[PDB]
């Protein structure tokens, strides 16, 4: 297909903490944060993209963590009072670790947010 013309940001097999469960599950995805946008495939092969994202009409945010928190989680709401997601209005993304956190969110703001 293509080679070059590629520059990714950032990509990864994340898991939305807020996914619609009794609706399949595999709540782990392939995130893609590229320049252009960011969408998350069944794979890291994007092939079948199930839904594609920008980057200039989201935010990030602390988590609701209510009591205490329990990873760490960032959560995702569109600036245009919208909703993220089919229905959620933020799709809470966690993480493995600290550091990836940390990457992801550099990686953001690089590509406007």
Not at 7 to 20: A, C, F, K, P, Q
Not at 77 to 83: A, D, G, I, K, L
Request: glycine share 8%; with cysteine.
């Amino acid at each position: 297909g293509s080679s070059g013309s590629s520059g990714v940001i950032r990509r990864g097999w994340l898991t939305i903490n807020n996914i619609s469960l009794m609706k399949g599950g595999s709540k782990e995805y392939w995130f893609v944060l590229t320049a252009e946008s960011l969408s998350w495939y069944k794979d890291e092969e994007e092939k079948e993209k199930k839904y594609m994202l920008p980057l200039d009409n989201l935010k990030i945010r602390d988590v609701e963590k209510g009591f205490m928190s329990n990873k760490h989680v960032f959560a995702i709401f569109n600036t245009e009072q919208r909703n993220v997601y089919k229905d959620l209005r933020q799709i809470e993304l966690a993480c493995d670790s600290q550091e990836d956190v940390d990457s992801w969110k550099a990686s953001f703001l690089r590509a406007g947010v």
